Amino acid sequence: RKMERAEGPASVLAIGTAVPPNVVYQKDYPDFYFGVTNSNHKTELKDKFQRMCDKSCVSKRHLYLTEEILKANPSLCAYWEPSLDLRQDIVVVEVPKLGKQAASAAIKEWGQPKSKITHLIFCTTSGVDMPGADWALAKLLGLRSSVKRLVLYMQGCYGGGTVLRIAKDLAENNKGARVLVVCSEITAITFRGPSDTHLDSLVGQALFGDGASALIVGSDPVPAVERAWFELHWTGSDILPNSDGAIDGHLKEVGLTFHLMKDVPAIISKNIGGILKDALAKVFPAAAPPPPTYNDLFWITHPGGPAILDQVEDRLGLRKDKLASTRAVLDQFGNMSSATVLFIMDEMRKRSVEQQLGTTGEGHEWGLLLGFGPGLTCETVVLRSVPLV
């Protein structure tokens, strides 16, 4: 009553992305990384890393950190050196800055003045501060001083689902609300030299990249003025069984540490079916249309690593093209933690318009966005596409 609510489903009205300009191709990374960390003498460890990169299904990544910066800051090149203050000094500044680039692109596409942003959600796994990255981004953009802000820190790879789950309620419960949603990630918080005693940290050095994505989310788009690309219809969150300690990350004096068990793909792939069947049963209940088949949904899946995608595709019997947009982003950007699924959403709508398909979801009506991260946490969003032309 005192605050009127909206009527239609929360919708994605624009998407922007941004990446550091420095690109490192995966074929060059093993020599680049063991050279800059003064580890080339550890030949066996390096050959293990070569095999990880060869199997990563990542062709290239964008990285804030460059050879110059690393040689200037030797504490980032060792494996276990006090370096948190240095890392924070970097990402407390650069994470909002990259988010600002992505947010400016999203606002430009949206087409409305930036003062119509009423809410801001900023999600990151890269650094913490008070005031936070949300405050910094609001300052960089010049948002209204009364924007309702929320900073989601230390989220990890499920955060792209989390921000949609929250943005849905902000948009739908507040008439006129327009929510800027930013995920921004920079691996300077976690980059460190190699050690043959922590081989799971090696995996992160093969897969993690930098990037930021931004959405405008709102209900009741103004006809002929704003344009919906996807609709948020259902959300769910689950802690998978027997996953205690599957994915851990601690903010230590040596920076952000990464711990990752070899059974993560098995835990995800063996439990995701029941989760999706339950979610789809809630969205398409019997009392009535049956749920679409997996092959008739579009898929925006966090590519935690190729083994996760391969095992999910195998266990669910997905046709080999269902994860093509997901794998394209992994190939060209690596795993960008919470930002990754929004890059995939952008890739999917852009391919759909390019190829003149009938909807923003590759021609399918309904779709799924999945985030996976520490918990082991599974975030599920059931999405509807929008018809094209």
Is 53 one of the binding residues for ligand COA (CB under 6 A)? no
Beta carbon nearer to ligand NAR, 174 or 337:
337
**Residue in 53, 123, 157, 183 annotated catalytic:** 157
Binding segment toward a copy of itself, per CB under 8 A, in 18-26, 232-240, 288-296, 342-350 = 232-240
Residue 334 C-beta: closest distance to ligand COA, Å: 11
Chain-centroid distance of CA 9 in Å reads 22
Beta carbon nearer to ligand NAR, 367 or 373:
373
Beta carbon nearer to ligand NAR, 91 or 179:
91
3-state secondary structure 252-277: ECCEEEEEECCCHHHHHHHHHHHHHH
**Which residues in the 300-359 window bind ligand NAR by CB under 6 A?**
336-337
Residue 37 CB: number of other CB atoms within 10 A? 20
Beta carbon nearer to a copy of itself, 2 or 41:
2
Q: Is 242 left (phi over 0), alpha (psi -120 to 50) or beta?
A: left
Closest residue to ligand COA using C-beta atoms: 305
Q: How far apart are CA 34 and CA 105, in angstroms?
A: 36
Binding segment toward a copy of itself, per CB under 8 A, in 12-20, 29-37, 160-168, 316-324 = 160-168
Residue 192 C-beta: closest distance to a copy of itself, Å: 15
Is 48 one of the binding residues for ligand COA (CB under 6 A)? yes
> Distances from the Cα of 239 to the Cαs of 236, 247, 258, 340, 378, in angstroms?
10, 12, 19, 20, 6
Beta carbon nearer to a copy of itself, 213 or 235:
235
Structure tokens belonging to residue 194: 């190699």
The three-class DSSP label of residue 228 is coil
Residue 258 CB: number of other CB atoms within 10 A? 20
Question: Among the residues of 142-263, which ranges form H helices?
Answer: 159-172, 199-207
User: 15, 183 in Cβ contact below 8 A?
Assistant: no
The three-class DSSP label of residue 217 is strand
- Each residue 143-182 as x (binds ligand COA by CB under 6 A) or -, in order, gives --------------x-------------------------
Structure tokens belonging to residue 191: 């980059």
Q: Is 378 a catalytic residue?
A: no
- Residues at the interface with ligand NAR (CB under 6 A): 125-126, 130, 156-157, 185-187, 189-190, 204, 208-210, 247, 249, 256, 258, 336-337, 373-374
Residues designated as active site: 157
- Residues at the interface with ligand COA (CB under 6 A): 48, 51-52, 55-56, 157, 199-200, 203, 247, 260, 262, 264-265, 304-308
